[PDB]
Design a protein around this ligand. Structure first.
Ligand SMILES: *[C@@H]1O[C@H](CO)[C@@H](O[C@@H]2O[C@H](CO)[C@@H](O)[C@H](O)[C@H]2NC(C)=O)[C@H](O)[C@H]1NC(C)=O
Lengths: 115, 147, 233
């Protein structure tokens, strides 16, 4: 499908998208744990989702300290947390994002948060 | 030989003597009954006996009918009661909850007086004290959505 | 909360912050917190904070912390291929919470038909869970959601029961990971100045559309019975 014109974010109809001056546009946000190889899903517009192929993405809405336990496909378990040991097991971070062993999440160390 | 020495009546604004005789005499016994709100303390009662003694004086001259004392009001959780000038019979206290975060669950109005029987009582709750419990479901400020 | 807005803790003074794992709860009186079963399942002595808009580590150390005494998981939780029915639990506190401008309880639903959620009802969700920007929110977020037909939660294997409320769909607003256990606060139809906990953030598809909430109305009797049976002497 073709991209829709966007007045605001609400018009794009998906969080995989982001609006601009040339009013919508494919958002390719950094994925928390990412997907292996080229195993990402894509929507009607072909924008990269933060969900791996074969995964439905259904889960409890619990904030896992070391991230959700993910398989070799990149599928996050429905409601199983990583231990401190599997925090960086099955994760796909690209520079400058590296897996943070304390959160089980792809992070850039140089990145500075506003708070 | 002669005459049994008579004991005089009393100023009894706080009690009632029974039996009520014009002339009391050696070994006569009165039952002295305090009026409502008054008691005798020996630890208190509402009546006592007095005997006309051979010296023309009443026994138990050490027992008087005095106002009943409900004592210092007991405090409640999550509430306040201001300390009254007196805690004697007829004295009035007011309980109020910590508003607006608490309210009086059992109602009653929080107003208590010192009853004849010695308890702080409320017209609705009797001697049962107010219960101050949390107000639920009220945000301190309304959530305002981003326009 | 995705698609939401900044909220002050004063807007949701019943909101409880669970840490490790990252989650939410709802204070329902001075000795009890309501949350989802899956939040305290292997977390029977949960770390809980109240009274603060922010959950920055710096600020947590200055916040009111709640001391758990006992966690009561609902008997039907994981009793009977994924099935999240009866996703509800009660945390009894050791000490009574002092209420104030930043800390106060939310109401429970009544038992009458007036508290049967259906089309037309609206709720507020609140929490420090994932947003559009980050996987966790430092400052409290919130959003208003409509109740939605259950049919719309099950699209694009899982058990959907009448103990679950479907909500969302409008403007991408939804709850996400980190929001579990938080209350779906709904206006009380009989006392419109009050909110009550009609739902608890439970589970759903990848956030941004719809989600499922534990329908609290069906547990009121169990909640009442548990609180009475574990009184405060
Ligand atoms: C002292 O007198 C008061 C009179 O009010 C008694 O209050 C009553 O208490 C009983 C229960 O204890 C209630 O059933 C009545 O309704 C109350 N009277 C009211 C509300 O007017 C109080 O009990 C007495 N104190 C005692 C007997 O120790």
């Amino acid at each position: 499908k073709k991209l829709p014109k966007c007045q605001k974010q609400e018009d794009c109809g998906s969080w995989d998208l982001k609006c601009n001056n040339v009013t919508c546009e494919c958002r390719n946000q950094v994925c928390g744990r990412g997907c292996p190889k080229e195993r990402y899903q894509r929507d009607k517009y072909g924008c990269r989702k933060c969900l791996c192929k074969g995964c439905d993405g259904f889960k409890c809405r619990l904030g896992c300290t070391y991230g959700f336990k993910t398989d070799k496909k990149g599928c996050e378990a429905f409601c199983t947390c990583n231990t401190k040991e599997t925090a960086c097991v099955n994760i796909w971070c690209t520079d400058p994002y590296k897996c943070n062993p304390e959160s089980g999440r792809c992070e850039d160390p140089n990145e500075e948060y506003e708070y | 030989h002669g005459d049994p020495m008579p004991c005089p009546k009393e100023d009894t604004p706080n009690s009632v003597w029974e039996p009520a005789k014009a002339k009391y005499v050696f070994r006569d016994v009165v039952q002295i009954t305090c009026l409502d709100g008054f008691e005798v303390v020996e630890v208190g009662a509402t009546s006592f006996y007095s005997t006309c003694q051979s010296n023309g004086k009443w026994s138990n001259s050490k027992l008087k009918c005095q106002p009943v004392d409900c004592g210092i009001p007991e405090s409640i959780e999550n509430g306040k009661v201001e300390d009254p000038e007196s805690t004697l019979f007829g004295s009035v206290i007011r309980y109020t909850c910590e508003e607006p975060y608490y309210y009086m669950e059992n109602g009653g109005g929080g107003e208590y007086h010192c009853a004849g029987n010695g308890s702080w009582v409320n017209e609705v709750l009797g001697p049962e004290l107010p219960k101050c419990v949390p107000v639920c479901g009220v945000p301190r400020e309304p959530f305002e959505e981003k326009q | 909360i995705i698609g939401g807005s900044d909220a002050d803790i004063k807007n949701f003074p019943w909101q409880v912050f669970f840490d490790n794992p990252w989650a939410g709860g709802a204070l329902i009186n001075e000795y009890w917190v309501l949350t989802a079963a899956h939040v305290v399942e292997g977390n029977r002595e949960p770390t809980m904070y109240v009274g603060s808009t922010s959950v920055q580590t710096s600020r947590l150390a200055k916040s009111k912390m709640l001391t758990p005494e006992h966690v009561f998981i609902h008997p039907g939780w994981k009793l009977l291929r994924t099935n999240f029915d009866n996703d509800i639990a009660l945390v009894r506190l050791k000490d009574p919470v002092k209420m104030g401008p930043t800390v106060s309880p939310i109401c429970l639903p009544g038992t009458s038909s007036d508290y049967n959620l259906m089309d037309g009802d609206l709720g507020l969700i609140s929490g420090w869970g994932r947003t559009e920007k980050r996987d966790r929110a430092v400052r409290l977020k919130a959003a208003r959601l409509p109740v939605a037909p259950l049919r719309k939660c099950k699209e694009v294997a899982y058990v959907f029961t009448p103990n679950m409320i479907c909500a969302g769909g409008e403007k991408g607003m939804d709850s996400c990971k980190g929001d579990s256990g938080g209350a779906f606060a709904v206006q009380d139809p009989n006392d419109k100045t009050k909110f009550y906990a009609a739902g608890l953030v439970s589970w759903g598809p990848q956030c941004g559309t719809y989600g499922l909430y534990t329908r609290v109305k069906n547990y009121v009797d169990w909640i009442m019975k548990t609180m009475q049976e574990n009184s405060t002497p």
